[PDB]
Design a protein around this ligand. Structure first.
Ligand SMILES: *[C@H](N)[C@H](C[C@@H]1CCN[C@@H]1O)NC(=O)[C@H](CC(C)C)NC(=O)c1ccc(-c2ccc(F)nc2)cc1
Ligand SMILES: *[C@H](N)[C@H](C[C@@H]1CCN[C@@H]1O)NC(=O)[C@H](CC(C)C)NC(=O)c1ccc(-c2ccc(F)nc2)cc1
Lengths: 301, 301
C-alpha cells in the first residue's frame, strides 16, 4: 500500500509558533501556557556573533526590549531568564491553543518532525533523524532558528529539538527545549566539525521490513544468523553494533510479517557483502536508516 | 542550507477532517462551511464493490443513515446528493474552522501535500506529484479514502485531490473535489492498469537548480544548447518534451542562481547520455522529478 517518509500532522505545533524580535534580530519562539521559548542568540547584533557573552548581553535587556507577536497581536513580556542556550520570556497572556505537551531529550537514531518557520509563521514540515554524531539533515534558511522538532502520541506533543545553527558540511545542530545542545556544539559563529557518523543498523532493518510489507522481497534469503555473526560482518561497513535491545525493539515487526528478526539480519548481511547489483529497495539504490521501528509500525498500521 | 522534500503545514486542513459512517463502512470526509465531502463508495457494503450501481444504492439512503462525527460530536445531516464520484452531505452546523479555500484541478507534473487520515483523524503528511499517467505514489491503508491533497498560498487552501483507490502496481488514484477522476479510472473493485508513465523534464531541471543552490555542482558544464537539440536527445530516455512555457517557468530560478535555463539543459543532456558515474546529486543516484519549479523557489526563499 506504499511507503513514504511522512511527518506528523503539524497543526498542534502551528498554534504555538510566535515571532520574537530583539533589536533588529528576529527569529521564532514557542509559546506554551504563558512562556515563550526561543534561542538565546536573538539578543545578539550581527557583530556579537563571533564569540558572544550571552550573560553580559542579557543583563542589558529589560522586558520591553523583547517584541513578541502571535500573528497580528503583540504579547507583553513580563519576565525573562536564560536556561542554558534558550531564553524564556514570561508573557501576560497564556496561549489558548497550548496542546498537552512534554519536553524530552531524544537519543541518537530516533526521528522527529520539524516545522520550519520564518517570522513566527510555518513554511513546511519534514522528518529528520538524530544522527549518531548528533546532527540532522534539515532545510533551514536565515531566520529559521527557534523552529522546533517533535513527536506526537495520541494527543501529547513531545518537543525534542530547537534549531540553532548550520555546520560547514551542510548539516544542522540544535538543542533540546531545556537549551542543552545535542552533541559537542556551541551557539557561536565559528567553524565546528561534526563527529564521524555511523549507519543506524536497527533502522536499516526496520526499513527492510517496510520494503517486504510493500512489495519488495527479492533480498530475502533462506538463512538465519546469530547476533554475534551479524555484527562481525557489519562492523567493517561502519554500521553501529546491533544489541539485544535492538532485536527486541524489532520484535513486533517480525510478528507482523512472519520474518524472524535474525532472518532479516541474514538478508542484511548478504546485502552488505554483495551489494544490490542493479536492483532497488523501495525505489532506493542505497540502504536507508532514517526510519525507526516505530515509524514503520505507525505507518503500516 | 539543505534541500528536503517538504509538505505544507497541515493545521488548516486538520480542522476540516471528519469521520463518515454509512452502515458498517467508515471513511474520511472534508467539512467546509455546512457541507461534508466524501467518496461515494462509503455507501457500499463489502459485497457491492465489484461493480456498484451508486445511484441505485443512494436512493435507498436517507439523511439519518449517514453518521458524521467531528471528534466526539455528531453532526446532523440535513441533506445529501451525489456529484460525479463524491457525496455531498449538508449538515446543520457550519465548520467554525473553515479556512479560505478553493477547489482546483491540477495538471500532471504538479505537486501537492496529502494529509493521510483514518476515522476522521490525521495520521501524517507527505508530498506527492501527479504523474503524467494520472497516478500518485502515496501511502494509504484501508479506511484512508476521503483523505485530501492540497496546496496553500498565503492563507488560501486549494484542495485538488481526494483519495479513492489503489492500482495493481501499488500506485494510487483519486478525484478532484468535484468528484472527477484524474486519469481513466473508475471507483470499483476491479483490476485497472495505469498508463505508461514519463519523466517530468521541467521538474528534473528544477531539482538540478536546487542541487546547485545546496552544494552539488559537479554536473555543471561549460556548454549551452537549444531547446530543439535538447529534446532530440531527451526523447530517447522517455522524458517529456520541454516546451518554451517550461523554459519560462524556470526563468526565476535561472535569475536567482546565475545559470541560464539552457545552460542547465546542457548539463541535463550530458547526464542523460553519460550517466552519473558513481556520483550522486542531493544524495540521490537517480534524477528526481517530483519537485516543481515553484517547490524549489518556495523552499529556497
Ligand atoms: C537561525 N536563524 C540561524 C539558522 C542558520 C542560518 C543558515 N542556515 C542555519 O541553519 N542560525 C545561525 O545563523 C547561527 C547563529 C550563531 C549560532 C550565533 N550561525 C550559523 O548557523 C553558522 C555559524 C558558522 C558558520 C561557519 C563558520 C565558519 C565556516 F568556515 N563555515 C561556516 C556557518 C553558519
Ligand atoms: C479507501 N478506504 C480505500 C483505499 C485503498 C485500500 C488499500 N489501499 C487503497 O489505497 N479504497 C479502496 O479500497 C477501493 C474501493 C473501491 C474503489 C470501491 N478499492 C481499491 O483500492 C482496490 C481495488 C481493486 C484492487 C485489485 C483488483 C484486482 C487485482 F488483480 N488487483 C487489485 C485493489 C484495490
Amino acid at each position: 500500500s506504499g511507503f513514504r517518509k511522512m511527518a506528523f500532522p503539524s497543526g498542534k505545533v502551528e498554534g504555538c509558533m510566535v515571532q520574537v524580535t530583539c533589536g533588529t534580530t528576529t527569529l521564532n519562539g514557542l509559546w506554551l501556557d504563558d512562556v515563550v521559548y526561543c534561542p538565546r542568540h536573538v539578543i545578539c547584533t550581527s557583530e556579537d556573533m563571533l564569540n558572544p557573552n550571552y550573560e553580559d548581553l542579557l543583563i542589558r535587556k529589560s522586558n520591553h526590549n523583547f517584541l513578541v507577536q502571535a500573528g497580528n497581536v503583540q504579547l507583553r513580556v513580563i519576565g525573562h531568564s536564560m536556561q542554558n542556550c534558550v531564553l524564556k520570556l514570561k508573557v501576560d497572556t497564556a496561549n489558548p491553543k497550548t496542546p498537552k505537551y512534554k519536553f524530552v531529550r531524544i537519543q541518537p537514531g530516533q526521528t522527529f518532525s520539524v516545522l520550519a518557520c520564518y517570522n513566527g509563521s510555518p513554511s513546511g514540515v519534514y522528518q529528520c533523524a538524530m544522527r549518531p554524531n548528533f546532527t540532522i539533515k534539515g532545510s533551514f534558511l536565515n531566520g529559521s532558528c527557534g523552529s522546533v522538532g517533535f513527536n506526537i502520541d495520541y494527543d501529547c506533543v513531545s518537543f525534542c529539538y530547537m534549531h540553532h545553527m548550520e555546520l560547514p558540511t551542510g548539516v544542522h545542530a540544535g538543542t533540546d527545549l531545556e537549551g542543552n545542545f545535542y552533541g559537542p556544539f556551541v551557539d557561536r559563529q565559528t567553524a565546528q566539525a561534526a563527529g564521524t557518523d555511523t549507519t543506524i543498523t536497527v533502522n536499516v532493518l526496520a526499513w527492510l521490513y517496510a520494503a517486504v510489507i510493500n512489495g519488495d522481497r527479492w533480498f530475502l534469503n533462506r538463512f538465519t544468523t546469530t547476533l554475534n555473526d551479524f555484527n562481525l560482518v557489519a562492523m567493517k561497513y561502519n554500521y553501529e553494533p546491533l544489541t539485544q535491545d535492538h532485536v527486541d525493539i524489532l520484535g513486533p515487526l517480525s510478528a507482523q510479517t512472519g520474518i524472524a528478526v535474525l532472518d532479516m539480519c541474514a538478508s542484511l548481511k548478504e546485502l552488505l557483502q554483495n551489494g544490490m547489483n542493479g536492483r532497488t529497495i523501495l525505489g532506493s539504490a542505497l540502504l536507508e536508516d532514517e526510519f525507526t521501528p516505530f515509524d514503520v509500525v505507525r505507518q503500516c498500521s
